[PDB]
């Protein structure tokens, strides 16, 4: 009965965590997201993995999961593994609100999910949650935030994040087009349009294959704008006119 144990917890003679890295290299495939934390608002970007023509798109929602009133998350990795994680995460935020009757601060939410992941990285040898995922949100203490979960339980507050293996060069592009917080809510969207136009090798960015959702700050509302397709289309047309204007320098 013990010669069938795969041992997904024990340290290898190399010096790393064997099963953890292989979860990370499971992250690296099938996905590419990012968001732009720049002032009054914050955004998310997402890539259609199943862009086949015979879907319904009747969910009113894709990769995003509006998990509270003021937080959603972009996902990458195994899907229903994350659907279980979204259910538990949402339930944690709602039991917090039950406990205090005040909305949930985004970092103790992130530490709650990260300690859930660490608890299945640490004892027993169970299959680890092979899901990295993003965070957008709002609080009473900092305004607008972004966070990057890892299968290990490690997190980090970023200002423009990275998940997918296709987007490491995107982070290089983010640094080569680094700004100091100027959220005209069109420059950051044009920047993200430029990034996903370059990084995916999908030629000329059909808007059905992408997804952008934002979160703006209203006094009593805190609306989350999972925006429609036409403004994305004219954003792409705006950006390709700006690329033609940019290559008038040659």
């Amino acid at each position: 009965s013990r010669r069938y144990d795969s041992r997904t917890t024990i340290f290898s003679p190399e010096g790393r965590l064997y099963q953890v890295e292989y979860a990370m290299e499971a992250i690296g495939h099938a996905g590419t997201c990012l968001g732009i934390l720049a002032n009054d608002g914050v955004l998310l970007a997402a890539e259609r993995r199943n862009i086949h023509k015979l879907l319904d798109e009747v969910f009113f929602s894709e990769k995003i999961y509006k998990l509270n009133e003021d937080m959603a998350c972009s996902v990458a990795g195994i899907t229903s593994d994350a659907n279980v994680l979204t259910n538990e995460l949402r339930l944690i935020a709602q039991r917090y609100l039950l406990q205090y009757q005040e909305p949930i601060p985004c970092e103790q939410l992130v530490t709650a999910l990260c300690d859930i992941k660490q608890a299945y990285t640490q004892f027993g040898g169970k299959r680890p949650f092979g899901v990295s995922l993003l965070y957008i949100g709002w609080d009473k203490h900092y305004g607008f935030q972004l966070y990057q979960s890892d299968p290990s339980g490690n997190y980090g507050g970023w200002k423009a994040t990275c998940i997918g293996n296709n987007s490491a060069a995107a982070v290089s592009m983010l640094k080569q087009d680094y700004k100091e917080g100027e959220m005209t809510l069109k420059s950051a969207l044009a920047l993200a349009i430029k990034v996903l136009n370059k990084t995916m090798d999908v030629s000329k960015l059909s808007a059905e294959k992408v997804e952008i959702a934002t979160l703006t700050r209203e006094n009593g509302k805190t609306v989350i704008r999972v925006l429609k397709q036409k403004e994305v289309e004219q954003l792409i047309k705006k950006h390709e006119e700006e690329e033609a204007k940019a290559e008038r320098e040659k």
């Binding site: 929602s61 709602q94 039991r95």
Partner: protein, 204 residues
């Protein structure tokens, strides 16, 4: 009575195309008042309220418990909740404490989310629903509010006569009552907007 520990009265009245719910403001221990700003009518989404009467512990507990389950439902399903669904949820939540019962009498008044159809119902302390067409009441001064609404109600009511009818009903049924008084808050809602008025009740 444990029901007569803090007083309380909630009235809901169905109009023509709109619905009006009202309650009293007084909070205190049995003969001693404390404050005049105790909340008994809670918002559960848009154009749909709930009223709670009885012991204030179970009022706030069931309101927070219901808000918990309500937000979990509205996040698992992107749509907003139908009133029959809310009625069944409150019935199930109260019936989970069949032998550990809460001391409350919830009153639900809200509109249809698809049409402009009104809806009223009330429940008992164990989860007995009751849908009617005219009015439901809950609290200590039941018989007063029964007399008022069976005296003053008409079937097809413009919101002005609806407001004045529920106003006169609440004022007179509260003024005969002892332990429940100290102001009236009135929520009069419709398809377009939500109006909240407070009446000049006797502060005695």
């Amino acid at each position: 009575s444990i029901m007569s520990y803090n007083g309380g009265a909630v009235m809901a009245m169905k109009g023509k195309n709109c619905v009006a719910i009202a309650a009293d403001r007084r909070f205190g221990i049995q003969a001693q008042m404390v404050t005049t700003d105790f909340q008994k009518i809670f918002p559960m989404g848009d154009r749909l309220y709930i009223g709670l009467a009885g012991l204030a512990t179970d009022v706030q507990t069931v309101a927070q418990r219901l808000k918990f389950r309500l937000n979990l439902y509205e996040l698992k399903e992107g749509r907003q909740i139908k009133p029959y669904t809310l009625m069944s949820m409150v019935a199930n939540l109260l019936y989970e404490k069949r032998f550990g019962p809460y001391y409350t009498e919830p009153v639900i008044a809200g509109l249809d989310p698809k049409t402009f159809k009104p809806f009223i119902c009330s429940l008992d302390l164990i989860g007995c629903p009751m849908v009617t067409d005219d009015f439901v009441v809950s609290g200590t001064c039941a018989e007063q509010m029964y007399g008022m609404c069976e005296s003053l109600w008409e079937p097809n009511m413009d919101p002005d006569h609806l407001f004045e009818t529920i106003s006169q009903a609440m004022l007179n049924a509260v003024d005969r009552d002892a332990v429940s008084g100290m102001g009236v808050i009135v929520h009069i809602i419709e398809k377009d907007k939500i109006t909240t008025r407070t009446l000049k009740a006797r502060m005695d």
